[PDB]
Coordinates of C-alpha atoms and ligand atoms in Angstrom, one line a residue:
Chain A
X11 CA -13.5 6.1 24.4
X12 CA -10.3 8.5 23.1
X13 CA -8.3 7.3 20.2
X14 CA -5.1 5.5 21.5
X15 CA -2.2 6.1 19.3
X16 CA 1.2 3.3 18.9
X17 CA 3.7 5.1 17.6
X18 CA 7.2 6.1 17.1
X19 CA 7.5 9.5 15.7
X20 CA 10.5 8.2 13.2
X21 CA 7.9 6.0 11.1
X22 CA 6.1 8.7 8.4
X23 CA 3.2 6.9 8.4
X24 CA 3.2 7.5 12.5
X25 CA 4.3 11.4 11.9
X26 CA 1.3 11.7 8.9
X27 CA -1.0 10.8 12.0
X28 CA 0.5 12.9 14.4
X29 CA 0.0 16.0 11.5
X30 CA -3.6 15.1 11.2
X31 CA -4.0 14.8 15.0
X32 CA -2.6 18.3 15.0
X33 CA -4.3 19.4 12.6
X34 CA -7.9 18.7 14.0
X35 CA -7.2 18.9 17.5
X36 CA -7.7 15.7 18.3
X37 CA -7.4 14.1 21.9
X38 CA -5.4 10.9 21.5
X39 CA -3.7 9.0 24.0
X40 CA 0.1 8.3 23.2
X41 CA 1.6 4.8 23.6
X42 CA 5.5 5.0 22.5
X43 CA 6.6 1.9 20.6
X44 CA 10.4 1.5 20.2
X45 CA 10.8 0.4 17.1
X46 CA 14.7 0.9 17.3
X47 CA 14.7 -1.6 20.5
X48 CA 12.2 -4.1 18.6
X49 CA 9.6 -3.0 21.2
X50 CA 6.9 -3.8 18.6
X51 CA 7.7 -8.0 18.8
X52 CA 6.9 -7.7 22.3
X53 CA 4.0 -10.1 22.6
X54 CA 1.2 -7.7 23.9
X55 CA 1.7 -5.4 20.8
X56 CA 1.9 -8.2 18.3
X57 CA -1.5 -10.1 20.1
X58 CA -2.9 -6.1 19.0
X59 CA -1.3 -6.0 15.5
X60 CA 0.4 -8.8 14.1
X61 CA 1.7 -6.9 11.2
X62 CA 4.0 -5.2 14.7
X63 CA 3.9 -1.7 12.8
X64 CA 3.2 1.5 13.9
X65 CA 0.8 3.3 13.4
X66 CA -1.8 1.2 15.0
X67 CA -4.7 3.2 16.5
X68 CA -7.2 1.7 18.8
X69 CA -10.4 3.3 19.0
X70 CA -13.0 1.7 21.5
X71 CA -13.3 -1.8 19.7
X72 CA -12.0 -0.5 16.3
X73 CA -8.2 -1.7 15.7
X74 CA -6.9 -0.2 13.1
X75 CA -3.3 -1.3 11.5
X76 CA -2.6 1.4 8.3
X77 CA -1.9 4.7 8.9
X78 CA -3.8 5.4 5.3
X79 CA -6.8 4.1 7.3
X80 CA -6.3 5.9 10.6
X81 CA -6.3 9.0 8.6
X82 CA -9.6 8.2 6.9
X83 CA -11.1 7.3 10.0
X84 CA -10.1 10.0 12.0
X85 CA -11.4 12.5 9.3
X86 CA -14.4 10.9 9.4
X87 CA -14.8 11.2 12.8
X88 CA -13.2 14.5 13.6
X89 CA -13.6 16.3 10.7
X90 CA -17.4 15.6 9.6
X91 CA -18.2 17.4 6.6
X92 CA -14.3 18.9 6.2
X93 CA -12.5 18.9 2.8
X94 CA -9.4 16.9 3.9
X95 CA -11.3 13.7 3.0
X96 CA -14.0 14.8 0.4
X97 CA -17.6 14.9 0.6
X98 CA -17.9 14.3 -3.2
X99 CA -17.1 11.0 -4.7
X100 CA -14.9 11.7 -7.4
X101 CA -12.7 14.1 -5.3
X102 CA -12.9 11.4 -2.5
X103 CA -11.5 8.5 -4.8
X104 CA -8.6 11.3 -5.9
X105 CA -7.3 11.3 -2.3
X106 CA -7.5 7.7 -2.0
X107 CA -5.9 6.8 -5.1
X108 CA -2.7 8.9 -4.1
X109 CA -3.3 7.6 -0.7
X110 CA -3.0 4.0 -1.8
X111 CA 0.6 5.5 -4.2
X112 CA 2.2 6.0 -1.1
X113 CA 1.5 2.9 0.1
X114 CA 2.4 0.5 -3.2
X115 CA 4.7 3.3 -4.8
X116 CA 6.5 5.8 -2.3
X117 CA 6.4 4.5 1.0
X118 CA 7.6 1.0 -0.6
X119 CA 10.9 2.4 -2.2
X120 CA 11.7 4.5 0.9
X121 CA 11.0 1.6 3.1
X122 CA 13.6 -0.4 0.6
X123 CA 16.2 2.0 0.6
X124 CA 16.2 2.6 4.6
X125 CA 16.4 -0.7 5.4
X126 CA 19.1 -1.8 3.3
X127 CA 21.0 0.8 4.8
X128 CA 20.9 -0.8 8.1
X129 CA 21.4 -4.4 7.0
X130 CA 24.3 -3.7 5.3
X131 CA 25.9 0.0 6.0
X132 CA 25.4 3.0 4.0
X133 CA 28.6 2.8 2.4
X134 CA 27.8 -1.3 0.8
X135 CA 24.4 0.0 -0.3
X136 CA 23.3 0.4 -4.2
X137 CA 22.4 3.8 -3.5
X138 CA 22.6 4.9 -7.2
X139 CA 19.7 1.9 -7.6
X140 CA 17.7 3.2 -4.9
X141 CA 18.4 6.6 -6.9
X142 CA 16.9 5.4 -9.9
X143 CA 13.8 4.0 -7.7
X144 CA 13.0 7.3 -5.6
X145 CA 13.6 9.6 -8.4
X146 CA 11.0 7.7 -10.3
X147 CA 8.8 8.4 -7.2
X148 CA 9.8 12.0 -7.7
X149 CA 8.9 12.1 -11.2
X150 CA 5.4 10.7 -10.5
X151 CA 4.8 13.4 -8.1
X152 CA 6.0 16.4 -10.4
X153 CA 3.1 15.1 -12.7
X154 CA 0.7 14.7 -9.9
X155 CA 1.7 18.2 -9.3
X156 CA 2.2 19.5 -12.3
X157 CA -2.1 19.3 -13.3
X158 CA -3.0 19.6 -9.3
X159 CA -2.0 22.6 -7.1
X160 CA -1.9 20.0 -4.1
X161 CA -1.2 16.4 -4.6
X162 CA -4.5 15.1 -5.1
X163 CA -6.7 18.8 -5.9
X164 CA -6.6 22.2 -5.5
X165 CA -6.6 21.8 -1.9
X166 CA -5.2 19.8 1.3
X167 CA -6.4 16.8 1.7
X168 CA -5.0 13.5 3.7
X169 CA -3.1 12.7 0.4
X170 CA -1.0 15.1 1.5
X171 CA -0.6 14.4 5.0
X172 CA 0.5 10.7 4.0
X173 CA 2.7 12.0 1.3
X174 CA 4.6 14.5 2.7
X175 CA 6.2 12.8 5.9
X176 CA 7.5 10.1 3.3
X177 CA 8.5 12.8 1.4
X178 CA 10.6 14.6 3.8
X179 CA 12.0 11.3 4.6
X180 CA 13.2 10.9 1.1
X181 CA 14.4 14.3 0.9
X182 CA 17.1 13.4 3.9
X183 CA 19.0 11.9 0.9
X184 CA 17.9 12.7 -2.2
X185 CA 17.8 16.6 -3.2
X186 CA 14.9 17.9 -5.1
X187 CA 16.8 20.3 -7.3
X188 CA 15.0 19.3 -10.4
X189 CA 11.5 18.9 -9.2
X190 CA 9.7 22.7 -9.2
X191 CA 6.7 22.2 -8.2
X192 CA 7.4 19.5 -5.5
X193 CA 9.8 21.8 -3.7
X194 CA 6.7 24.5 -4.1
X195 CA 4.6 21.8 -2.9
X196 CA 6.5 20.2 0.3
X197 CA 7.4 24.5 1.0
X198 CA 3.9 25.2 1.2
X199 CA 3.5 22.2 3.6
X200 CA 6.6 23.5 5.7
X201 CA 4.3 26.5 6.3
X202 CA 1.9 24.6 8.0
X203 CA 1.6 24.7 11.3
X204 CA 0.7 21.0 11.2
X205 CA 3.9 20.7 10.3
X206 CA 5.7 20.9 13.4
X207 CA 4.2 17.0 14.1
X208 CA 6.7 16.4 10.8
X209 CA 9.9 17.7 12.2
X210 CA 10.9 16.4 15.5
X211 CA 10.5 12.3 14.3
X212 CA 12.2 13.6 11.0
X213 CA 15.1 14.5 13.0
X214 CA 14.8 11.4 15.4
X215 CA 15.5 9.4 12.7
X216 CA 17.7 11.5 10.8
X217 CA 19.8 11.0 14.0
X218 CA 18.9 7.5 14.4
X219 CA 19.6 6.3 10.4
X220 CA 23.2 8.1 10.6
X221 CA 24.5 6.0 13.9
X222 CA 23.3 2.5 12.8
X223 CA 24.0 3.0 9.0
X224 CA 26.9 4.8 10.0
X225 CA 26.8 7.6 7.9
X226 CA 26.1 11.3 7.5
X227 CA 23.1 12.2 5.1
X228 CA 24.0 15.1 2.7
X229 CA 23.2 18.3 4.3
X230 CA 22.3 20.2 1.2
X231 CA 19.6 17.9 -0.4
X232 CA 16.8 18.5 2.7
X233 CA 14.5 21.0 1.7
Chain B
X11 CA -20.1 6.7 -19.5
X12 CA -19.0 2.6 -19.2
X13 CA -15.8 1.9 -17.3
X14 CA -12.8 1.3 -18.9
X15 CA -10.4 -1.1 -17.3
X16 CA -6.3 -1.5 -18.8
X17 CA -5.7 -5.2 -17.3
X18 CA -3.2 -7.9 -18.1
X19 CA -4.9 -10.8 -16.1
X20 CA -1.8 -12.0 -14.8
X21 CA -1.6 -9.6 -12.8
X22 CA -3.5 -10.4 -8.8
X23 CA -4.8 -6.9 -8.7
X24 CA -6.2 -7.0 -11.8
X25 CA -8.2 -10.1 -10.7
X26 CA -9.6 -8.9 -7.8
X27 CA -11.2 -6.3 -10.0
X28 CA -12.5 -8.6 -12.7
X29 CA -13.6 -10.8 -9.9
X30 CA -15.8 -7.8 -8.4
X31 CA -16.8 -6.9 -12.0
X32 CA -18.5 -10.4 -12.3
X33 CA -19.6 -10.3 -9.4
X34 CA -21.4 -7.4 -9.9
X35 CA -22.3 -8.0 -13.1
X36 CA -20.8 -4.5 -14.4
X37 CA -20.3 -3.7 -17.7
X38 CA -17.2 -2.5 -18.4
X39 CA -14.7 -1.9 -21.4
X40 CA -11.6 -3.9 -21.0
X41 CA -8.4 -2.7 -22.6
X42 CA -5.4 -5.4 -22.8
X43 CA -2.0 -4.2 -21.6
X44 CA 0.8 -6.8 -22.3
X45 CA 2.8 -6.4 -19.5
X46 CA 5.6 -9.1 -20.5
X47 CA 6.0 -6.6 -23.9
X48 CA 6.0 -3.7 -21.5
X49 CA 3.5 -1.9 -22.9
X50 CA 2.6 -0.5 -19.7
X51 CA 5.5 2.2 -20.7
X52 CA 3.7 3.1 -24.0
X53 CA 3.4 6.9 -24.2
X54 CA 0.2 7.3 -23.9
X55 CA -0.9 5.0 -21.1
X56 CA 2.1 6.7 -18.7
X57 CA 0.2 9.9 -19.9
X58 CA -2.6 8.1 -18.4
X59 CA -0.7 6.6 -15.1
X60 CA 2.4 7.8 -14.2
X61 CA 2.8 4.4 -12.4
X62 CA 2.4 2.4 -15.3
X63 CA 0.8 -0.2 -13.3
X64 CA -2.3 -2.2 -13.6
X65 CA -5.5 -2.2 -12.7
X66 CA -6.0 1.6 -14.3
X67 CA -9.5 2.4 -14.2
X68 CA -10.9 5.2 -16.1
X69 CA -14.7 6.0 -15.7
X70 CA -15.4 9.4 -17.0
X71 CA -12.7 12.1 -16.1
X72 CA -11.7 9.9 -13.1
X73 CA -8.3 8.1 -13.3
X74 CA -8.1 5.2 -10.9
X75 CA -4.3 3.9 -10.5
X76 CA -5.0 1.2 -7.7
X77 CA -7.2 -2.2 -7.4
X78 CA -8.0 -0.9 -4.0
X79 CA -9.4 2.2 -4.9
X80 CA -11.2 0.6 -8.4
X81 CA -12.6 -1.8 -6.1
X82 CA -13.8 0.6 -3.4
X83 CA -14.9 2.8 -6.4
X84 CA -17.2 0.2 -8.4
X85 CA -19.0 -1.2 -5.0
X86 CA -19.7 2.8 -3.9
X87 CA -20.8 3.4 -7.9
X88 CA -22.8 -0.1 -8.5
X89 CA -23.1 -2.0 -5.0
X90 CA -24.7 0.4 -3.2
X91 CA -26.3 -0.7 0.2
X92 CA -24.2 -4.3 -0.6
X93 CA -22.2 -6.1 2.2
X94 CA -19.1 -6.3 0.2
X95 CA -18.4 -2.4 1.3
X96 CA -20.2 -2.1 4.3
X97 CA -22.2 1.0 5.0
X98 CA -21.6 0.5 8.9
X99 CA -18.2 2.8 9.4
X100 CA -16.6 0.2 11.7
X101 CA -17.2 -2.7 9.4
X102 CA -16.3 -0.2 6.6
X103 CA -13.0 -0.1 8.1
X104 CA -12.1 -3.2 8.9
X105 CA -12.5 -4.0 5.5
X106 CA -10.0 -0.9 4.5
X107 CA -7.6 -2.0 7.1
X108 CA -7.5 -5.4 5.3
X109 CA -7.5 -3.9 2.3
X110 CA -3.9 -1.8 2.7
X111 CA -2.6 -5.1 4.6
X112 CA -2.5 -6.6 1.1
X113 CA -1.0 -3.3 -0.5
X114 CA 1.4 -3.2 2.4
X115 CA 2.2 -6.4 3.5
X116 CA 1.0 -9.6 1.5
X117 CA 1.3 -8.3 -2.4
X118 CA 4.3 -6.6 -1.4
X119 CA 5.8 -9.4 -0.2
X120 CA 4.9 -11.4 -3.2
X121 CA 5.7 -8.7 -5.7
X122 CA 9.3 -8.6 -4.0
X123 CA 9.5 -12.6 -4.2
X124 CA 8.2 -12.7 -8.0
X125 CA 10.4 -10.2 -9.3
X126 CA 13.3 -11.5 -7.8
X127 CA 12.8 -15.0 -9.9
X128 CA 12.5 -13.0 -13.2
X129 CA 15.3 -10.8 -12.3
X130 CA 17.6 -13.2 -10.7
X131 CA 16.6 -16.3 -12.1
X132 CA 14.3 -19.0 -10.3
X133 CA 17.9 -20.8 -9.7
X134 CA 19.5 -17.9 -8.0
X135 CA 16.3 -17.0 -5.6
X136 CA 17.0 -17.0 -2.1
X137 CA 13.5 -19.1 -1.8
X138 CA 14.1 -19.4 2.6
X139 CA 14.1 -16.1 2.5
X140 CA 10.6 -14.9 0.7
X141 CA 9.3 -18.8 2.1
X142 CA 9.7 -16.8 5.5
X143 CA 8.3 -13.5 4.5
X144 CA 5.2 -14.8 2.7
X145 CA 5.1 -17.7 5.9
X146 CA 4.6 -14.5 7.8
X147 CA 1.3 -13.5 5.9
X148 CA 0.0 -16.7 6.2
X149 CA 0.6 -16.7 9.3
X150 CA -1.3 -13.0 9.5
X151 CA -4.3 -14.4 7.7
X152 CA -5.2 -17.4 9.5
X153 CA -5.1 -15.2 13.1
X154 CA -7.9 -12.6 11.2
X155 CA -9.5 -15.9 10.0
X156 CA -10.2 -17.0 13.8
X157 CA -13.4 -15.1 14.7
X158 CA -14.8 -14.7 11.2
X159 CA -15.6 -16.9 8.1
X160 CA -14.3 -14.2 5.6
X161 CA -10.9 -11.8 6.2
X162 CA -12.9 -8.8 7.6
X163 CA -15.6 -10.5 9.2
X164 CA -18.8 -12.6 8.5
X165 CA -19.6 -12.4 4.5
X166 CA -17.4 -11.9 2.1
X167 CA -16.0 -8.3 1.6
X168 CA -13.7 -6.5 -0.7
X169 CA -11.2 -7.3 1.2
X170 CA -11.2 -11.3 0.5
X171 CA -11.1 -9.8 -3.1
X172 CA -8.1 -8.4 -3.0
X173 CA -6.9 -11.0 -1.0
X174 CA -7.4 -13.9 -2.5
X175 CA -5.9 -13.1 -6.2
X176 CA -2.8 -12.7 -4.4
X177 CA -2.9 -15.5 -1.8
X178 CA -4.3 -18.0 -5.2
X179 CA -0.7 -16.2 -6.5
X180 CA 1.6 -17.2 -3.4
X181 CA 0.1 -20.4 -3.6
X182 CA 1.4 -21.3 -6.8
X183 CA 4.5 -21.7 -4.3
X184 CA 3.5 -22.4 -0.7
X185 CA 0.6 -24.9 -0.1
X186 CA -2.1 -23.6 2.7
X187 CA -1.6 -27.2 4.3
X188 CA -0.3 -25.7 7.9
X189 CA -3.1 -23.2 7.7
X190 CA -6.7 -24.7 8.3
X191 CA -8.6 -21.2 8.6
X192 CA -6.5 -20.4 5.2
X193 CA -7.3 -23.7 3.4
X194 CA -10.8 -23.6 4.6
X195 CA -10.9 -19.8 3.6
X196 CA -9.6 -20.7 0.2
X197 CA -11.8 -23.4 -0.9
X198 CA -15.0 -21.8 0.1
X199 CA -13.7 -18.5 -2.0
X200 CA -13.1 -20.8 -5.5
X201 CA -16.6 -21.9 -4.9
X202 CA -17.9 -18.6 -5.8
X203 CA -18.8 -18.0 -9.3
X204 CA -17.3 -15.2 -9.5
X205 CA -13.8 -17.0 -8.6
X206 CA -14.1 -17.9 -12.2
X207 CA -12.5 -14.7 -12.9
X208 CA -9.5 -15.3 -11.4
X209 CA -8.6 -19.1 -12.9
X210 CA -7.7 -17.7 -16.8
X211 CA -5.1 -15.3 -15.2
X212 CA -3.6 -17.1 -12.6
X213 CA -3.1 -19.8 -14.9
X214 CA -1.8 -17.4 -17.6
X215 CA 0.9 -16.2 -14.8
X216 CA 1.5 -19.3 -13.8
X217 CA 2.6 -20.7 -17.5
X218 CA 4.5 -16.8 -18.3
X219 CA 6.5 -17.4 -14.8
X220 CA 7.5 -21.0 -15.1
X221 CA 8.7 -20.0 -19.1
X222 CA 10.8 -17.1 -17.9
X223 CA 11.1 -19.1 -14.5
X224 CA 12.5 -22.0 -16.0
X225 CA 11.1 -23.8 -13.1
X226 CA 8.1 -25.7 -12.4
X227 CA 5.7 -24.9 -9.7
X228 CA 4.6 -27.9 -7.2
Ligands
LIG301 C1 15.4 -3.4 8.3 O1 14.6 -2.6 9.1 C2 14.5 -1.2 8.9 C3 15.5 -0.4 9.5 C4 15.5 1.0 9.4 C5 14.4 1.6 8.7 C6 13.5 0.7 8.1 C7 12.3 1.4 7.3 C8 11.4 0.4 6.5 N1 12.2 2.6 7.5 C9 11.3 3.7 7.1 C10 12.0 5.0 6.8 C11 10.3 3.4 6.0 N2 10.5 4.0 8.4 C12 10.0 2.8 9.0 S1 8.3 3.2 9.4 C13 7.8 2.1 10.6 C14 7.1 0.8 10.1 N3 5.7 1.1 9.8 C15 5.1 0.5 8.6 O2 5.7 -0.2 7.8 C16 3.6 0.8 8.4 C17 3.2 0.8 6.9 C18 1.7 0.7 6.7 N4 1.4 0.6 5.3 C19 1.1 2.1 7.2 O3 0.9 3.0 6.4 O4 0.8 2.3 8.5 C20 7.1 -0.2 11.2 O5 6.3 -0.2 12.1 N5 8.2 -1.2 11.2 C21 8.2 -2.2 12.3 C22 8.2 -3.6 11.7 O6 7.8 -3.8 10.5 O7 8.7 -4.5 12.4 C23 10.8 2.3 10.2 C24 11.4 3.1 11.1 C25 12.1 2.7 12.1 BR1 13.0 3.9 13.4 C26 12.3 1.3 12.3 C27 11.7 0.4 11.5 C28 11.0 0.9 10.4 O8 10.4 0.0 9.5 C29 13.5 -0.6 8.2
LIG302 C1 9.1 -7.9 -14.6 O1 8.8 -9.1 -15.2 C2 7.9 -9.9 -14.4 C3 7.5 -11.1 -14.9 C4 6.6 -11.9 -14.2 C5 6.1 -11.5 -13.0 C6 6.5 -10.3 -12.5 C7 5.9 -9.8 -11.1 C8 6.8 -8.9 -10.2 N1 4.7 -10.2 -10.9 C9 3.7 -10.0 -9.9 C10 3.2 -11.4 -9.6 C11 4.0 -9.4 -8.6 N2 2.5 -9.4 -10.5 C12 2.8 -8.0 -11.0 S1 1.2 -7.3 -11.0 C13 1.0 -5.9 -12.1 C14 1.6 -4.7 -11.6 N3 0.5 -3.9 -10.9 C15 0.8 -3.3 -9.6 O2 1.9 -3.4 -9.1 C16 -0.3 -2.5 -9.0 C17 -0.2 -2.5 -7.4 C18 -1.2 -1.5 -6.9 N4 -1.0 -1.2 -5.5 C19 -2.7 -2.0 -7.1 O3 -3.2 -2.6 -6.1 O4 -3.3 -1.8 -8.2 C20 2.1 -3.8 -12.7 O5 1.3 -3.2 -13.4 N5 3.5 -3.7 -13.1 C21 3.9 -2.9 -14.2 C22 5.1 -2.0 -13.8 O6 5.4 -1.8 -12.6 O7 5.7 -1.5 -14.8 C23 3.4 -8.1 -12.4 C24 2.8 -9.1 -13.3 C25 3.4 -9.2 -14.6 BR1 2.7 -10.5 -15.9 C26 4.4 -8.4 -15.0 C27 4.9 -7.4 -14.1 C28 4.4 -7.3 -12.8 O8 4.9 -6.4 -11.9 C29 7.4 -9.5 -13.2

């Protein structure tokens, strides 16, 4: 049975699937889930994932709920033997651990600042505490970057793939002026043709996060 | 060379790894890092970990910065062929799944709720509000408890690890008693021996939050 994908294209965990699924070349069936509209509460969807996120990739009997696994699983299956999830241990536990930094570290603080921009408006939100937060995040990954060409070795891996899509997301607000090597970094990503899976959900929600916050993101700080 | 693990007990994700190092029997150096003095920020262990979080696992020149990964780690390195990291990819992810549920959903949740009562004050917490948010993981927990015995299926796996230093945390203060998959779940984890490993900290967590707190837990 082909993967089935849940997904809306705004979430970065959905759009770091969608650039692995690009990637490989991988055959997945699509199954949109408004997340704008609250189309993940609909019963069906939360009988499948009670957490109601997206990603949430079913695979014959496999359910999977994380987008950090969906990309080790998918590797596993689609890219046997590749480098983006490694054969060796230690290099294997490197891409976990920065998977598992997006999840408790980055992805946490974006997912903070985002939503308090909806529940209260962009212009009621601490946004120089959410600053402080995501620059820290920035910080982290300078240094990650700083003794590693990519972010978890000298090569792309699904560290990246998680990482970036959060990434770019931050980026919508928060320039990266004073961080070298992570605008090296999320360039060299750009280049990749993967890529392309980045872009259009970026914008969705770019367009999205600017009507219900009611605001304009500045222009200048996106990379 | 031997392991070396930077802990402070209190901390859940720290327990799920000392609960997997005695279950395992591994030998490893522990290093003490008072969180409540913040030396998590000391030069040289944000040198270490940029995150200046623990668990931080350091075995040889790899630098773990996650309970999920250490754990995955130390089962790969000294459980091989053991059930509590399947070999069998499917079961192998089911455990992961459950595994980044509690990074994503139930320690966050917690994390978000404790903070708030050293940060605004036990007094000043908006307790409906995180009594609905952790509700919600509860609620999560007992459906994956309805098939299975243990969180990712029928023996115990790394995930109930990870889960169950937490869920011991969140029920410092929300009792299991609407939740008879939960209850059940959690009494037949603190028969383990191994759960031994996670009464000192809990306990120590307990006595540092109700001090800064200023509250009592039921
Ligand atoms: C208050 O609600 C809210 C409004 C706007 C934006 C957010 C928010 C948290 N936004 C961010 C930018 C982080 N994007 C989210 S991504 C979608 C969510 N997916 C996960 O949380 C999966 C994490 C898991 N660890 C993994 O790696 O897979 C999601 O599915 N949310 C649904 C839900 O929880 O009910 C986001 C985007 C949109 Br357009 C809408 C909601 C989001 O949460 C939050
Ligand atoms: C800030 O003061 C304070 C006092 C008491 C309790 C807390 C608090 C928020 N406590 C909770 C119960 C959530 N426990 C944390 S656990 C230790 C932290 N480790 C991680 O966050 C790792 C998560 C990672 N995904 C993983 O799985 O390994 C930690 O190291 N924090 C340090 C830091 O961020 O600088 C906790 C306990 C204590 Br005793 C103190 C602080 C904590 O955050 C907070």
């Amino acid at each position: 049975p082909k993967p089935i994908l849940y997904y809306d294209e705004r979430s970065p965990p959905v759009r770091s699937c969608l650039m692995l699924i690009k990637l490989l070349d991988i055959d997945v069936e699509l199954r949109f889930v408004n997340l704008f509209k609250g189309e993940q509460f609909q019963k069906d969807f939360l009988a499948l994932n009670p957490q109601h996120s997206v990603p949430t990739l079913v695979h014959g009997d496999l359910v999977l709920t994380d987008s950090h696994a969906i990309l080790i699983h998918l590797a596993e299956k689609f890219d046997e033997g590749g480098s983006l999830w490694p054969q060796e241990h230690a290099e294997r536990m490197k891409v976990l651990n920065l998977l598992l930094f997006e999840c408790s570290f980055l992805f946490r603080r974006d997912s903070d600042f985002m939503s308090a921009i909806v529940r209260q408006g962009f212009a009621n939100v601490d946004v120089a505490h959410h600053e402080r937060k995501l620059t820290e995040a920035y910080i982290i990954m300078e240094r990650y970057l700083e003794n590693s060409d990519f972010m978890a070795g000298p090569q792309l891996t699904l560290a990246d793939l998680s990482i970036v899509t959060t990434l770019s997301t931050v980026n919508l607000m928060f320039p990266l002026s004073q961080f070298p090597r992570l605008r090296r970094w999320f360039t060299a990503m750009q280049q990749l043709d993967a890529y392309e899976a980045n872009c259009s959900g970026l914008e969705k929600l770019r367009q999205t996060m600017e009507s219900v916050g009611s605001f304009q993101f500045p222009s200048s700080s996106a990379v």
